[PDB]
Amino acid sequence: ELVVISKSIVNPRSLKKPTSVKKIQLTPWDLSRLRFGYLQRGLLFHKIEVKQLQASLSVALDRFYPLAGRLVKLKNDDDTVSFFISCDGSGVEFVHAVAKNIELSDVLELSGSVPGFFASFFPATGIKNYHGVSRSLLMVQVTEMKDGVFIGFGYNSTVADATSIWKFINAWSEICSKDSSGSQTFQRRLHLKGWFFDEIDYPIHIPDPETKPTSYVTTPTNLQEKMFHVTKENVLKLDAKANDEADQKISSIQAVLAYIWRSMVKHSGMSREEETHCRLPINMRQRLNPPLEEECFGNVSQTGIATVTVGELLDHGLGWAAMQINNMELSQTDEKAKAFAENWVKNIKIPVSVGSKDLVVTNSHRFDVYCNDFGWGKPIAARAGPPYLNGRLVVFKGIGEASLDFQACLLPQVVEKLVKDAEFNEYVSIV
Amino acid sequence: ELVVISKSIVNPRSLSVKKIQLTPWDLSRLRFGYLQRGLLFHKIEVKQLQASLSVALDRFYPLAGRLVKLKNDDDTVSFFISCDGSGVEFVHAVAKNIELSDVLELSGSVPGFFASFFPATGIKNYHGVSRSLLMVQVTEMKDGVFIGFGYNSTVADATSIWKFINAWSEICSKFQRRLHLKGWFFDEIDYPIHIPDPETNLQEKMFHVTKENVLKLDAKANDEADQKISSIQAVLAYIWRSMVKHSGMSREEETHCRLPINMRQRLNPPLEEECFGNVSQTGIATVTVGELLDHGLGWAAMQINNMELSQTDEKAKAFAENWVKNIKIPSKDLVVTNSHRFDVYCNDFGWGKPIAARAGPPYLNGRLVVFKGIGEASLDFQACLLPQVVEKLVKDAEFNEYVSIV
Ligand SMILES: O=C(O)CC[C@H](NC(=O)COc1cccc(C(=O)O)c1)C(=O)O
Ligand SMILES: O=C(O)CC[C@H](NC(=O)COc1cccc(C(=O)O)c1)C(=O)O
């Protein structure tokens, strides 16, 4: 129940005399994601005016110009290909849609089988990162609802990590809020991530990612999504309990993730001998040597993986699970990252999926998603879009900074057991 | 914990004195405390809030008045509201360690820190001779702002106070008709009315009911009931049955659901929807515990609806006229307050709609403050409960399916 009003390309609006076309080189981290789908997130508002939003977007794209570029695929004479990002100002796909029968309650209170109507609010479903040669690296959809507006976006993981994407959304909202021409918002020089793998030749020669199985997103699933809210009081309670049991210092988010992990596995139906993983995004800017600037733009995120058996996770307590997470984070070193990049170049792996039997943590509690006031008020919710993956756990800072929200994608049988888990529902509010 | 930055008397912006006479409904509430409610925001600029309040008091000028107490020669007293522009008490305070999470998620013993966000705790309606009839406190938090207010029930009902808040925020964000007062609608009662001189371990939880679960309860109640039942009647009945189930009361006890009734359209002649003043009464549905527990949701909902249908003009008149010859100026009930009809979120003062609405002290067992949800189809309730009832409610699987308790 969604009609498209307009589909257009939004180009950067360049007050400056345009410079040459910058080329951005792709690392093993970027190339190993070429077959994954665009990541899709969005913000819910009481009010957004689309004209101002589109105008301010063109200005913001000038300031974050790699988001307006395209992948370029080179054919090597050895029958491999190479990719780089060309900052050519090709522009961003921008969709204006209307879903006049959908109201805020419907998106705030989402609960149950996915995909549902909400999937259609996102613009990049089924788009893979290697499609960025011909589709934009950022895609935006603004959907007017009965009594609100949703701004959804999808982005190519080869051009940006979530840290960078949320910095762009914050700049865009600031411009939109103050004046759409950008004349009243400070322009800042963009620092690029650059090339930080000094022992790896580039561009890296890889097999063509499109000459690969190419697997569907519209296939029927049995997945559901639920929202989990953890209050400040309960975050603190979990934090204290994890630290009481643990032998090293455990952060609040580690304790809460460990609690969710244990609970998710308790109700999974997995055998004790199965391995379960907690996959966590790690911002590597400050772990690399030399470290990169905290504001450098691009994907500088690595996925850390904590591995245990189901039996181990259930037999030990909360503090032990939190220690597995923390130990994994501590292991994500510079020497590790570089050695592994050099191994990747001699055993290229570009998977189509992550796997469905893990806790797959994404986004971050650190991103101030509510600071995105476009001029009519801060958002009232932050959500993720397709694709749907069992075990996905999207982390959002709460409207209350001390609280946490999680958007969890789970099998129906797991939800059914989770909603009857008395202790879980003491610590976590499921909607 | 709470630091006061400033206190001001805000009069109407514009520079005989109109008298508003008090009805038996007003006079009966003289010993009650001021009612206190408020709105939570990301951002409020205090200077603009205060200037706009002066402008708003031009329109809602009774809120800037004072009670006047007359001593009559027959050893009684009389009260009226003198619209003298004395002004509204306006307090600016800072709670630097309190954050949005704390107010959104209040849960547990009351009174707690939040009580201090409200300006009129311990103030009774008869104190309006010397204290303002509306009191405002704007409390800056670590990462947000709360606008708390208390009001004297002799000058306004909740319908009127929320219309005032709506007008104030509209003025601050920047009226085709002038303010019309409710007037004297008891033609068989003389004024001023002569009266005698009028002078617990509780917890609060937030309940949210989703659009989906409101509709489920509505459908259930209507399937069971023989008259049409509204969504709010169905949800209130469900909460009522659940509270009584976990109350510890025996079958023979009488228990009540108390509900605010806007009487404007029930009076004859009916009064204008926007007429200003207190034109509300409390309706009381009475049942025994055993009956409420034995019968289903639709029957409880019918008890509420039947009570509402009985709130007639003729009854109100007869009761008021006898009240003047039997002045009465004064639990484990369901005490419903506020209403789903009030649009909480239209109160944008210029920096964004509110992110929550809340009630303040006083705290009383069984209070259930109704707020329309951010999601317009949904409902929020601020419930004041005994710890033993809470413990039973959190272990009630069905209740926690229909209602999200935080
Ligand atoms: O950015 C991240 O959270 C991981 C990025 C990347 N993974 C994918 O790009 C596809 O798998 C996922 C994993 C998590 C969330 C989603 C989603 O669509 O939200 C998809 C990786 O694992 O290195
Ligand atoms: O407006 C209403 O809900 C009732 C008004 C009045 N009642 C009192 O003035 C004192 O009893 C209450 C009842 C409900 C809430 C509170 C509170 O403090 O929120 C106090 C009455 O019965 O006509």
- The reply to whether omega before B111 is within 30° of 0 (cis) is yes
Residue B356 to residue B345: CA distance in whole angstroms? 8
What is the resolution of the experimental data for this entry, in Å?
A: 1.8
8 A C-beta contact, residue B7 and residue B67 = no
Q: Which residues pair with A225 in a beta bridge?
A: A112, A409
Report phi then psi at A303, rounded to 5: -90, 120
* Nearest ligand to the C-alpha atom of residue A33: 1
For chain B, say whether A373 makes contact (Cβ under 8 Å): yes
8 A C-beta contact, residue B58 and residue B14 = yes
Q: Whose structure tokens read 């209740």?
A: B399
Provide the experimental method for this PDB entry: X-ray
Q: Rg of the Cα trace of chain B?
A: 21
| Residue A130 Cα, gap to closest chain B Cα (Å) | 39
B145: which chain A residues are within 8 Å (Cβ-Cβ)? none
Of B373, B395, B404, the CB nearest to A431: B404
Element (H, E) at A282: strand A275-283
Residue B27 to residue B24: CA distance in whole angstroms? 5
Catalytic residue at B197? no
Side chain identity at B93, as an amino acid letter? Answer: A
Nearest to B388 by CA among B233, B228, B201: B201
8 A C-beta contact, residue A107 and residue A154 = no
- The reply to whether omega before A203 is within 30° of 0 (cis) is yes
Q: Which residues pair with B22 in a beta bridge?
A: none
Side chain identity at A74, as an amino acid letter? Answer: L
**Residues followed by a gap in chain A, C→N > 2.5 Å:** none
What is the residue extent of each domain of chain A? 1-221, 222-431
Residue B400 to residue B394: CA distance in whole angstroms? 7
- Please indicate whether, in this complex, the C-beta atoms of B100 and A399 are within 8 angstroms of each other: yes
- Please indicate whether, in this complex, the C-beta atoms of B345 and A46 are within 8 angstroms of each other: yes
Residue A60 to residue A171: CA distance in whole angstroms? 6
- The reply to whether omega before B192 is within 30° of 0 (cis) is yes
Residues A40/A44/A47/A51 CA torsion (nearest 10 deg): 0
Residue A325 to residue B260: CA distance in whole angstroms? 53
- Please indicate whether, in this complex, the C-beta atoms of B104 and A403 are within 8 angstroms of each other: yes
* Nearest ligand to the C-alpha atom of residue A114: 1
Of B107, B376, B404, the CB nearest to A105: B376
DSSP output for A49-93? -HHHHHHHHHHHHHHTGGGG-EEEEEEPTTS-EEEEEE-----EE
* Chain A with chain B: Cβ pairs closer than 8 A: 84
Side chain identity at A209, as an amino acid letter? Answer: P
